[PDB]
Structures are given as C-alpha cells and as structure tokens.
Design a protein around this ligand. Sequence first.
Ligand SMILES: [Sr+2]
Ligand SMILES: [Sr+2]
Ligand SMILES: [Sr+2]
Ligand SMILES: [Sr+2]
Ligand SMILES: [Sr+2]
Ligand SMILES: [Sr+2]
Ligand SMILES: [Sr+2]
Ligand SMILES: [Sr+2]
Length: 144
Amino acid sequence: GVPFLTELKERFIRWLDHDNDGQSTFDEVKNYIRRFKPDVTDQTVAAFISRRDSNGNGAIDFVPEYVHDMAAPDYTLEGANEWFKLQDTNDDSFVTEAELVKVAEAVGMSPEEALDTVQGYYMSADANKDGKLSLDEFKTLYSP
Ligand SMILES: [Sr+2]
Ligand SMILES: [Sr+2]
Ligand SMILES: [Sr+2]
Ligand SMILES: [Sr+2]
Ligand SMILES: [Sr+2]
Ligand SMILES: [Sr+2]
Ligand SMILES: [Sr+2]
Ligand SMILES: [Sr+2]
C-alpha cells in the first residue's frame, strides 16, 4: 500500500537523520545499525548506503532516495538478505530466536513484545524447528 509521507519523514528523523538536514551520512547510518548490531563493520554500513544512494553522494537523501524506496515497498531476496545479515549478530548465516529478540528489544520493543513477535510470527518460518532461521526460511516472512 501507499505510506503516509509525514510518517516516513518522522521515521527518517528518528532513525537516520536526527538533525533533519535531509541526509543520513555515514556516522548517522552507523549509529542507527549499532542500536541492534553494535559491532557492525564500516563496510556493512557503506553497502547499506550504496543500495539506496542513486545520486552517488555517499549519503541516503530523504528525497528522492528514502521516499522512492519506501513509497513502493516490494520484496527482493537481496533486500531481505540485507536485514537477515544485520540480524545475524555473529555472522554464522542463521538468525536465532535469541538474536531476533535482542534486535527487537534494541529497536524499542519491551521484553514480552519482543518474545511474542519472535516466538509467534518469526518462528512460524522455522520449518525444521531448530530454533533459528536460514535465509530461505526468513525470506518467507515477507509473504504471509
Ligand atoms: Sr537539534
Ligand atoms: Sr544528517
Ligand atoms: Sr557487520
Ligand atoms: Sr544519495
Ligand atoms: Sr547468528
Ligand atoms: Sr510458536
Ligand atoms: Sr530452521
Ligand atoms: Sr508466502
């Protein structure tokens, strides 16, 4: 569906551009990802910016880039993999229940809200019940 542009802006400010200058520069994207992957590498942060940076100015611009990306959200494996990798705190190519719960708490959920999100919705994709998601399990969460 179509997002509320005013909410997109409030989200962009609160997550990526605290100063509302219209750009999310390196240290801003890093402070964003560090909330939930505290030992995120500088190169991960750079690749996140590059997928969004259509004008090549090394920054995520609210306009046109954030609005373009968010106005028409769509599924791709590459896009799903980016969030998978950011939740894979130990980079072992699985997201465990505990990693997903810690990320949920880090982005502002209470302990019980985080547990109920992960143990309900996320683990519904755990086809072999081993307590963790592969990329192939995780990607199914985009098409309930
Ligand atoms: Sr200020
Ligand atoms: Sr900024
Ligand atoms: Sr990283
Ligand atoms: Sr840009
Ligand atoms: Sr992991
Ligand atoms: Sr369950
Ligand atoms: Sr599994
Ligand atoms: Sr589906």
